[PDB]
Structure formats: C-alpha cells, structure tokens
Amino acid sequence: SKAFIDVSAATLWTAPDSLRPIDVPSATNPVDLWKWTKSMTLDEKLWLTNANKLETQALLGQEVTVVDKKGDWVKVLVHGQPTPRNEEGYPGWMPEKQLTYNQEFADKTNEPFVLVTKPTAILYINPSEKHKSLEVSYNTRLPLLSEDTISYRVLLPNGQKAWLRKNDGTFYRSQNDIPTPAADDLINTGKMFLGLPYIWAGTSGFGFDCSGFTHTIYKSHGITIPRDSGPQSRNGVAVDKEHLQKGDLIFFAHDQGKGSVHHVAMYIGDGNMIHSPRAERSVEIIPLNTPGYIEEYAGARRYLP
C-alpha cells in the first residue's frame, strides 16, 4: 500500500535493523542529518559503502509502495527513482515511523507544487501548536496552497500546513511541466552545492553520492534519469569523446574503463566536470584529465533533448 516520506530525507538500508548508534539521527522522526554526517569520521562514512549498508534516500513527500514489514522496519519501493532492480521503485528498508499517510495530501499529489530550489531551506509550520519548523532539501515538492508577496503556503505529507520564503522555491504545474533546462541551468544547479560533503547513497542537499547528485540535478529540472551510475550510463543517448557538450554525463569504470561503472560526473565545458566524488571530499569541479579518472573513462550520455 501507499505511503509518503514524513521526514526531510529518509535513508533506505539494504537490510533492516542495521543501524549503528551514530546512525540514530538518520532514523528518527524528525531526522537530524547535519548531526548524522558531521558526527562521522571518514572510516564511519566509508563503512556505509564497504559494508554495503545503504540503498538510497527519499525526500519529504515522496511516494513509496510498502512491500514488507519486519518489526519497526518496512521495505519500500521509492517511486521516481528508476532502477532495473524493480519496475515500481527503488527498494530498501526504512523505519516505519518515517512514513505517513494523509488523504488530503494523497489527493493533492497531482496538483501544482512548490519545488525547493536552494540547497536546503526552512519550512515554517503554521498553524503549529508548538511553532515547529523543518529544514528541507533542494528538490522537495509539496502541493501549493496559496501565495502572498513574501511566501508560498504548502501542504505537508502529515496534513499540516507550512510556508517558505518565495526566494527558497519555485512553483510548477507538474514534473512534466518543469521547463526543459539549458545545460547552463544544470551546471548552475550543481554549483550551488560546491563544498557539500559526500555521503554514500546521498540523494539530498544534506549530502550526495555521485549518482544521487546527477539524478537530483536532472530530476529537479523535469528529467528523470536512473538513480544509480550503472543504469545512468546505459540511458539517454551515447556521446563520443570528441562530441562532449555541457551537461553530458561522464562515466568511469573499473579496470581501465572495461568493468563495472562506479562513478559519474557532469561535463561543464572547457575540459572540466562537476561531481560529488567520494567520502574524503565534497561537491567539486576538476579537470576531466585528472589521473585516475582519465584511465577509467567509460563513455558519456546525453539526456537533454
């Protein structure tokens, strides 16, 4: 059955009940994802990848299909994150307490919405008995209720009403009606995140992995590409090295480009690329001709019409 993400961003696990104590702030409702990421050492971040712990992250209001339940954990398919693993959505395990269902929100899912357009922004719940607020990610979509000279009012997945400053968001009729981006729009979007530390499976303005970054940049501009780097590398139109253009996605694969794809970056022209590269680093711009990367070059895809 149908449910909605009830936290700024939910982290989905490859198995239920796999949290360390340091991961607790990712699993509560509400979350504290700055506490989560900023508290971790490098080794603690790398464990997420090397012990194969995470699947993806889903944002506030994103719809999921609940498919299994083990204790306090549910297995869900995240709609809007394409993967060859499952035709309905991206699979993984998350705490049930991070999901909600409100009929009014469910009915308004196909109405015009506000898309959050800064890396993160503050939503103010109004009315709220305890004057609550929520820091939300870039690419969060909530149904638009009303607009004044300074703000948009929106509906939260739990049925509460909230507002954000107009400068923190944009409204659109639907995903399908987000205008087609120019390559520079995509680049400018990526640039907003320069210096944001990497996290495995990161799919929000609280931290990205390389494919979560590319998926999020495209999705926020109306183009849904696969969640993961391997599938990203086999969708869109194949581009040859001599024909690289701004916005093109560039892929790197193990064994000198011959094996599995494990990195993706976006070409930004003049020989440079932007990416969220690895746990040791942050969203950054580097040359395509960087040692390591250049030997693993495994092709390029174009997603812009």
Residue numbers in the entry: 29 to 333
Study authors write:
Here, we report the crystal structure of YkfC from B. cereus (BcYkfC) in complex with l-Ala-γ-d-Glu. The final model of BcYkfC contains residues 29–333, one dipeptide l-Ala-γ-d-Glu, one phosphate, six polyethylene glycol (PEG) fragments from the crystallization solution and 265 waters. The three domains of BcYkfC are arranged in a triangle such that each domain interacts with the two other domains. The active site is located at this SH3b1–NlpC/P60 interface, whereas the SH3b2 domain is distal to the active site. The catalytic triad of the peptidase domain consists of Cys238, His291 and His303. Since an oxidized cysteine can no longer function as a nucleophile in the reaction, the enzyme in the crystal is inactive. As the dipeptide was not added during protein purification or crystallization, it was most likely to have been obtained during protein expression in E. coli. Since this dipeptide is one of the reaction products of BcYkfC, it unequivocally identifies the S2–S1 binding-site cavity, which is formed by residues from both the SH3b1 (Glu83, Thr84 and Tyr118) and NlpC/P60 domains (Tyr226, Trp228, Ala229, Asp237, Arg255, Asp256, Ser257, His290 and His291). The dipeptide is stabilized by multiple hydrogen bonds. The free amine of l-Ala in the S2 pocket makes hydrogen bonds to Glu83 O and the side chains of Tyr118 (OH) and Asp256 (Oδ1), which are highly conserved in the YkfC subfamily of NlpC/P60 enzymes (see below). The l-Ala methyl side chain points towards a hydrophobic pocket defined by the side chains of Trp228 and Ala229.
The crystal structure of a YkfC ortholog from Bacillus cereus (BcYkfC) at 1.8 Å resolution revealed that it contains two N-terminal bacterial SH3 (SH3b) domains in addition to the C-terminal catalytic NlpC/P60 domain that is ubiquitous in the very large family of cell-wall-related cysteine peptidases. NlpC/P60 is a large family of cell-wall related cysteine peptidases that are broadly distributed in bacteria, viruses, archaea and eukaryotes. Characterized NlpC/P60 enzymes are almost all γ-d-Glu-DAP (or γ-d-Glu-Lys) endopeptidases. The first SH3b domain plays an important role in defining substrate specificity by contributing to the formation of the active site, such that only murein peptides with a free N-terminal alanine are allowed.
